[PDB]
Amino acid sequence: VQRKQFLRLLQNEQFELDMEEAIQKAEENKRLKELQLKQEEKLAMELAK
Amino acid sequence: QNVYGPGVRIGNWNEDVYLEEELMKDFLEKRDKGKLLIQRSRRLKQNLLRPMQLSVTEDGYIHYGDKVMLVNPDDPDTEADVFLRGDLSLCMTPDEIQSHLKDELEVPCGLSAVQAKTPIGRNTFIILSVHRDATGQVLRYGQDFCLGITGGFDNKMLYLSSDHRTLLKSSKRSWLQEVYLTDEVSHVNCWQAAFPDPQLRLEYEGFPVPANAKILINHCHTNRGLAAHRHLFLSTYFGKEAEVVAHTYLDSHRVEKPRNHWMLVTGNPRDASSSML
Amino acid sequence: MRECISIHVGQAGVQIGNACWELYCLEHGIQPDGQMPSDKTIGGGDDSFNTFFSETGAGKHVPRAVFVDLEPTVIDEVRTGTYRQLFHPEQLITGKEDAANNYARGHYTIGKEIIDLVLDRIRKLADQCTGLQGFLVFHSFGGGTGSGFTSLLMERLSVDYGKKSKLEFSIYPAPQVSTAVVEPYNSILTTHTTLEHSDCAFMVDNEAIYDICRRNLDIERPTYTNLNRLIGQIVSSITASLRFDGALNVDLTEFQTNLVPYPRIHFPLATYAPVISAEKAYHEQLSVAEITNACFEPANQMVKCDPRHGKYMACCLLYRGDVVPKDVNAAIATIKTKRTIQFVDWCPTGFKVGINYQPPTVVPGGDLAKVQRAVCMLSNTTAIAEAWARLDHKFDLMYAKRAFVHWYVGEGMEEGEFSEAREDMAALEKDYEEVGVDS
Amino acid sequence: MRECISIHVGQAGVQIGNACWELYCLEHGIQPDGQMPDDSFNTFFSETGAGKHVPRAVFVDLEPTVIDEVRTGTYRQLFHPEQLITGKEDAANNYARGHYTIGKEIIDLVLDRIRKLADQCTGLQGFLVFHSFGGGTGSGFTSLLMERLSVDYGKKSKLEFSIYPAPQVSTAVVEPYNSILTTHTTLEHSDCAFMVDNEAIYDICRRNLDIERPTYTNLNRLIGQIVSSITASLRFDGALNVDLTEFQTNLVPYPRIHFPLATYAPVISAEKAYHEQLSVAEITNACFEPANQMVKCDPRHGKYMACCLLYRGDVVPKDVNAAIATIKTKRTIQFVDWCPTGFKVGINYQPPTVVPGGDLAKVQRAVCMLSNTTAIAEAWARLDHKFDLMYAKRAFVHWYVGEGMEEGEFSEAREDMAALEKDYEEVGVDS
Amino acid sequence: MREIVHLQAGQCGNQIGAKFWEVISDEHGIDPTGTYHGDSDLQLERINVYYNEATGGKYVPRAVLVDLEPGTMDSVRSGPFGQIFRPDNFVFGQSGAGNNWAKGHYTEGAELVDSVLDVVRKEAESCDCLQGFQLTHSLGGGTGSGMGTLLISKIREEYPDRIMNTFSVVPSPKVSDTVVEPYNATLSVHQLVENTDETYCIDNEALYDICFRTLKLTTPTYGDLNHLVSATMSGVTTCLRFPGQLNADLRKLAVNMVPFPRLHFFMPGFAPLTSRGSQQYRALTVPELTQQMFDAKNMMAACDPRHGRYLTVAAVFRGRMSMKEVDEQMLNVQNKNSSYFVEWIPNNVKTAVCDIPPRGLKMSATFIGNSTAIQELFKRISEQFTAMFRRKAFLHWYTGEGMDEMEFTEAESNMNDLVSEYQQYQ
Numbered sequence A: 001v002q003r004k005q006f007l008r009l010l011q012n013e014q015f016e017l018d019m020e021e022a023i024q025k026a027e028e029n030k031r032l033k034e035l036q037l038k039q040e041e042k043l044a045m046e047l048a049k
Numbered sequence B: 001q002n003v004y005g006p007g008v009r010i011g012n013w014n015e016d017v018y019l020e021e022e023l024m025k026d027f028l029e030k031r032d033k034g035k036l037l038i039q040r041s042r043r044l045k046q047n048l049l050r051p052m053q054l055s056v057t058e059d060g061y062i063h064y065g066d067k068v069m070l071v072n073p074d075d076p077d078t079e080a081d082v083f084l085r086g087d088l089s090l091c092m093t094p095d096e097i098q099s100h101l102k103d104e105l106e107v108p109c110g111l112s113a114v115q116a117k118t119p120i121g122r123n124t125f126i127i128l129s130v131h132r133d134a135t136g137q138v139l140r141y142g143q144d145f146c147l148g149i150t151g152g153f154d155n156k157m158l159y160l161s162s163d164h165r166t167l168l169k170s171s172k173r174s175w176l177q178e179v180y181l182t183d184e185v186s187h188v189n190c191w192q193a194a195f196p197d198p199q200l201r202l203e204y205e206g207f208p209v210p211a212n213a214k215i216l217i218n219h220c221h222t223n224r225g226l227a228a229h230r231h232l233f234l235s236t237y238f239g240k241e242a243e244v245v246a247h248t249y250l251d252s253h254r255v256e257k258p259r260n261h262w263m264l265v266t267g268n269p270r271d272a273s274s275s276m277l
Numbered sequence C: 001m002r003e004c005i006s007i008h009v010g011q012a013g014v015q016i017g018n019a020c021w022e023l024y025c026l027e028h029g030i031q032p033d034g035q036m037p038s039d040k041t042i043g044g045g046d047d048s049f050n051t052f053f054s055e056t057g058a059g060k061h062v063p064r065a066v067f068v069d070l071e072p073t074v075i076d077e078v079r080t081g082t083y084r085q086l087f088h089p090e091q092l093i094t095g096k097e098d099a100a101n102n103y104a105r106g107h108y109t110i111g112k113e114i115i116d117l118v119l120d121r122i123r124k125l126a127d128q129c130t131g132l133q134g135f136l137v138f139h140s141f142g143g144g145t146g147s148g149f150t151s152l153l154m155e156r157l158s159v160d161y162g163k164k165s166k167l168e169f170s171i172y173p174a175p176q177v178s179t180a181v182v183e184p185y186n187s188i189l190t191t192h193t194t195l196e197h198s199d200c201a202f203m204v205d206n207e208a209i210y211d212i213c214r215r216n217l218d219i220e221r222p223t224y225t226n227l228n229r230l231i232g233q234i235v236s237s238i239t240a241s242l243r244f245d246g247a248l249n250v251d252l253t254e255f256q257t258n259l260v261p262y263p264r265i266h267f268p269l270a271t272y273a274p275v276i277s278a279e280k281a282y283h284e285q286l287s288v289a290e291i292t293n294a295c296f297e298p299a300n301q302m303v304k305c306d307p308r309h310g311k312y313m314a315c316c317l318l319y320r321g322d323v324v325p326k327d328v329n330a331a332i333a334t335i336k337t338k339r340t341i342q343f344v345d346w347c348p349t350g351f352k353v354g355i356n357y358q359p360p361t362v363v364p365g366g367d368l369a370k371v372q373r374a375v376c377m378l379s380n381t382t383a384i385a386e387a388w389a390r391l392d393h394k395f396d397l398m399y400a401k402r403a404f405v406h407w408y409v410g411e412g413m414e415e416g417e418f419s420e421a422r423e424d425m426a427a428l429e430k431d432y433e434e435v436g437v438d439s
Numbered sequence D: 001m002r003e004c005i006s007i008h009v010g011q012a013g014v015q016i017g018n019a020c021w022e023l024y025c026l027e028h029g030i031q032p033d034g035q036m037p038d039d040s041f042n043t044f045f046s047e048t049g050a051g052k053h054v055p056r057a058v059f060v061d062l063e064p065t066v067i068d069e070v071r072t073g074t075y076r077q078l079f080h081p082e083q084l085i086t087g088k089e090d091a092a093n094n095y096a097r098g099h100y101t102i103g104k105e106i107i108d109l110v111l112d113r114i115r116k117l118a119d120q121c122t123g124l125q126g127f128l129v130f131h132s133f134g135g136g137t138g139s140g141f142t143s144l145l146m147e148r149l150s151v152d153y154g155k156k157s158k159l160e161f162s163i164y165p166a167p168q169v170s171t172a173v174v175e176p177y178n179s180i181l182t183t184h185t186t187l188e189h190s191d192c193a194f195m196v197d198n199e200a201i202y203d204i205c206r207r208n209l210d211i212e213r214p215t216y217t218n219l220n221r222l223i224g225q226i227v228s229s230i231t232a233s234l235r236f237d238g239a240l241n242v243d244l245t246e247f248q249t250n251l252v253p254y255p256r257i258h259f260p261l262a263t264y265a266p267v268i269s270a271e272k273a274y275h276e277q278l279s280v281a282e283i284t285n286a287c288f289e290p291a292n293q294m295v296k297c298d299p300r301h302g303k304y305m306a307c308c309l310l311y312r313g314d315v316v317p318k319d320v321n322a323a324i325a326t327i328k329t330k331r332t333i334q335f336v337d338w339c340p341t342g343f344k345v346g347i348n349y350q351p352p353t354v355v356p357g358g359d360l361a362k363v364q365r366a367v368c369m370l371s372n373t374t375a376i377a378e379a380w381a382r383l384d385h386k387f388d389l390m391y392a393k394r395a396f397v398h399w400y401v402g403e404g405m406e407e408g409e410f411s412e413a414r415e416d417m418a419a420l421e422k423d424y425e426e427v428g429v430d431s
Numbered sequence E: 001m002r003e004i005v006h007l008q009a010g011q012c013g014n015q016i017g018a019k020f021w022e023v024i025s026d027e028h029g030i031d032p033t034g035t036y037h038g039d040s041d042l043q044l045e046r047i048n049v050y051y052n053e054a055t056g057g058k059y060v061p062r063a064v065l066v067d068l069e070p071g072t073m074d075s076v077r078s079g080p081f082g083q084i085f086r087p088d089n090f091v092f093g094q095s096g097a098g099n100n101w102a103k104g105h106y107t108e109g110a111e112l113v114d115s116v117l118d119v120v121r122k123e124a125e126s127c128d129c130l131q132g133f134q135l136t137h138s139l140g141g142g143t144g145s146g147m148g149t150l151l152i153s154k155i156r157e158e159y160p161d162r163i164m165n166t167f168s169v170v171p172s173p174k175v176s177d178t179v180v181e182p183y184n185a186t187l188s189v190h191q192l193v194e195n196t197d198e199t200y201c202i203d204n205e206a207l208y209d210i211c212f213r214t215l216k217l218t219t220p221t222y223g224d225l226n227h228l229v230s231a232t233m234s235g236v237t238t239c240l241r242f243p244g245q246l247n248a249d250l251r252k253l254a255v256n257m258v259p260f261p262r263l264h265f266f267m268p269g270f271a272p273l274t275s276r277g278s279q280q281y282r283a284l285t286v287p288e289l290t291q292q293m294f295d296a297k298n299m300m301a302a303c304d305p306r307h308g309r310y311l312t313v314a315a316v317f318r319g320r321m322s323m324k325e326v327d328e329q330m331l332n333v334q335n336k337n338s339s340y341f342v343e344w345i346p347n348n349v350k351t352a353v354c355d356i357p358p359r360g361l362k363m364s365a366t367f368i369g370n371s372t373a374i375q376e377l378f379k380r381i382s383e384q385f386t387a388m389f390r391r392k393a394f395l396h397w398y399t400g401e402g403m404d405e406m407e408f409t410e411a412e413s414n415m416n417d418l419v420s421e422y423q424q425y426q
Ligand SMILES: Nc1nc2c(ncn2[C@@H]2O[C@H](COP(=O)(O)OP(=O)(O)OP(=O)(O)O)[C@@H](O)[C@H]2O)c(=O)[nH]1
Pocket: C009, C010, C011, C012, C013, C015, C016, C070, C098, C099, C100, C101, C102, C140, C142, C143, C144, C145, C146, C147, C171, C178, C179, C180, C205, C206, C224, C227, C228
């Protein structure tokens, strides 16, 4: 019983960590996509000019 | 039928969208206010596992007020098939479930032996005199001294303590006398250092104790030695630890067993973060 | 705390026990050296292995099972294999000169010599059990040891231990393909004894698993290693409630209570779904309805009998993994409105449902795929009397000319129980008809 | 105790309501959340638990494409989650698919909401149903909705706003069939139905607002102001206020002639308003000019039959009176002889409110004209002429009869718009 | 909410369909692996139309691949997007049809279809609200015309009230690739008139001329023409998956464009088609697209619209457009061509505008046409039938398989009923 309660508490901590990672990854993806699009547009402008 | 999931606008999606938005809002409110379990555990681990600098001795005699580390040496015991190997360090251990539910440390706190070599905030002990106001003093054999641990906290001082056995007071697993930490000042915090060899013990009583040497630590009011149970395992928030009790162990020749041998470890002069080991 | 003692007798029991006991070591993470890996400092709270694995002061875990045979050909490969250090030196019992597919050698002459050595080892294994659920038996009908030595082992087990549960996993002869010539003689005699000395007899044959491995896993050329794993997967889903947690757990007495209506009818059928290859699971959606729709199809039966000829009496559904109790009720309710599935009149509620949270664990490099949910159905059907019909047709067609009888009379067995064992299941066939009569 | 229930059926009815409810939130100061950071909002909103202001509209469609645009848009927190009702498949511009086959599977949920909404209101004044004639849902589903409403609520007024099919420009092909099939049931269970079309608003945006490229998001703002001008006499205070019952008496002389025209003035852009002068004697002449009628018809061929002018904003009642007698002495504005008094004027105190980012200008005073006239006999003549050239060869018929509605309904509905056609000459001939 | 079942039969049908899943998986941001990687939230809004979700939220297409020889079955599987289909849905035989319609409809087509109809029964019964079917094949083959029209009739006996949409590559005079083309085309369209709600005729002559004049491609590969076809398939059904100002599903397209039950053969088109050199000179406006749409060189069939009359025309637009520009342009083109449209139907044109244009482009306009000129594509097949049937040439492969000579006289009579029915209204 004692170690089962310990496992339950550790699982709760793992749930919080999983939620934090799930909210960070979307921000990273949005930043990468925006940077790639802006760089592509600038390169097109320069070559055309 | 078939099910798709979160994003797809099919079936009963509106109530799921409401429920996930409510859960996300609650999670952000809790983590912004700071009631998050991982944040509390992170603060507790940052307080506990802080690095610390030990004292450095010149003439090899342990001084009052110096910061030392208690280390049980390793011996090839044949008592049990499974037991901790290598030198162990005496580290305090708070209660796990109460430590998760509440931020503040709950006195009394138990002790343990951990495979640790670098001095951290959990295993630095300061040798103190019960008479106090001691400057330029040498710790001697057969003399009373006390051990105080700050424990990674700059707030309070805690001391080792033990008492006579009672039907309501016992160790966690070995059912022997226990050793704990209290902030009270009494005679149950005083310990004595004695020579391991019984023939020369009274001859060496009253001599300055060497540093980094095997000595016996004996309580005063109960006259039990500090002992480390290697074969009995304690589950802890920081892994598996050996047990610690107060009991005197004798072989067939009435010589103290390697369980009772303890060694006080100072800091390396070349690198203060590392020890003499 | 609730512990099972498994018995494996014959060559079938050892070879099933090689693949069955590999899964328990690979489910709890117990190495072939006998010790759990040291990389478990964070992990804890696990004591579910005590049903089968006994601790030691050195941290070693040894199985709670006995391996019995009358030849050293099959157990010496275990003793010199990968798992030589894991099993006990004495829990692997060897005989001499086997039984040669003869029931009299297995029961009266050779199976009498070593029965005292095995009975000591069971008793030496039963005192450590602070709580024992019962026994599990793996053997074969068509063998000499699996049918001869088993027939008196169940007689000695019932005398020593009174009302303890006895559950069987037997290798029934397949209707078309088989190996031994005199298999009707051995199959008739051993099940005449064990009608009253058993409590539940799960059966599976060898042809119906050949059909499964062809059209599901796309294996053209299987061996017994491919077949033993699927039988080894059924045993885990049956016993998973005693090991792991769940919303509804079943003990070894709970699904014995809900599958035998009368004392003479203790013959279920074993089925398993979903079974699929590694590639085809990657695309097909596995709903709770689609894994219980596969169990009711006659092509997925693991005994070569069509359930459409007969009527179900009682059923047991044993779920694993990410199963919600909502979808169990909706999938069962669809089956209740099916006309193809027929039920007897006196069992209005035939379903017993158990759920365990552990998803099914699959051996690395195996033919079957890693899935999150699976169901094993132990269904009782009247259509197993078709299986007894084709074998008793085979028996009197060979007993008429007194073929092979001198192998049985000249060993120590009287010819008088050749007729009585046929007359025993003549009345048993009358019993399956009267149960199926609608009131 | 003055309450109005809005029902938005079809895509054209719902998409106007996206811009109709945008304007009502600005009138009363209600945020899109539903919060108000005194009680003139009670006509269109019901404050509920927690202070959220809940609207009084039911958004029903057989297709989930358009409602899910609002359930994910910027007005998610405003409407009730059970007032947004969807189906599974559309009507496919078929009358018998929105009324005979698929319209019966959702009609119990539609009337359950209207029954629940009406119990919260203390005094119910009428209904405001929005749809279009041409589509299947705006024909099939509004036909049985007001059929079941007229047996449940007897004497409550039913105000209708529909998109009339334009003469030369149209989207679908079977719209001559669906316009005839709608109006068979409207003449028995509707009390006042207002026609607008899509070609007249295009020419207003081209010439008056100076917009080169109009869009459906632009027309819905103009229709959103006319409905907010009719219901402005109930929300606010005025010199003399018009109730929903009392402009149904003075616009409907006969039970079969209840199809007035909607006209708003002044509809001006930003760059032109600060130059030219906006007097009451000029904004009422802009209602009578042939260019500014919002239905593609010429009023000069017919004669006016009943006129209602609803002034709002800074208006003195004197110059309204001098403007009416200015109209009556003009020979080109011809009135019927049997109705010597035909002008009904109404003064309110609240000026119009401009939506930020919009195309309209900030105007101090405005007038909405609701004119009953005989000029729409020409509009119903051209649509009947398009029905006869298609029913002669039985084109597009088997899509109707394949659902459950027999071919006998085409000839019965044709003879009814035949019957009401000569009712316009029977009232246009001078005594 | 609305679902569409896809089926791929014949060598020409599999290659177009495998190119068709290229376009929409890029539209919805799906990798060949099956994992969603897109940017907007409007792409996962309606993924249930064409896709099913699997374990791990991984997407699989809802299509059935049927054939008789594994030659083109392994070509699609070893393609760019071949590792996304269901491996159980790959249903095939071992013996080729031999470009014979009797091998695909009586001899080898009657054995495999029992397994073929099971997988399309699995996908239909698990759908929420099934909307219709979709099938790509060719009229001139033995596999694409044998079981191409056999799968149509069997589904009609199961699901009566749906919309059954097929895309058929029609035979042409100058791009004849088979000696027995006139026999197989007549034998297929006899059941296409009976049991199909809308059929699209696509001709290889017009596909090459688009690749030659407008696109200025000197060496068109068969991978190029399948991209021309795949644009019109995704354009006619874009109102089911994406929001717009005027939503029109497949059944809405059925009511407007089918005046009589036996006139449902359509010409398709794609509007923004431009070459590599002259992209800079062109200006993208709504009146520019309408002029491109009503060009004679832009439709996918080799029929002259100037030798006929138009019954019903629709055009599905894509992108951000004003609505006066769309509505006034399809009124100007009807008034400026009044004799070309019929006089017993007013307002032949039809409008459809969607909010989301295709990837990498600003606007789009998918064109569809009904005309009386489609009889010229049907007289040439019917006339080639007579010159081969009188000598009874190539009949002993058909008549020796289980087929009578009375089916050929029955099917030829059905063309001349159909050819006269377009000429009757002209
Ligand atoms: N499916 C399966 N069947 C097995 C396996 N091992 C043995 N059998 C069955 O066992 C039958 C033959 O009898 P055995 O088990 O080999 O020998 P036995 O039961 O010990 O009898 P004796 O050799 O006389 O002692 C065959 O018909 C098989 O069906 C196995 O690993 N898998």
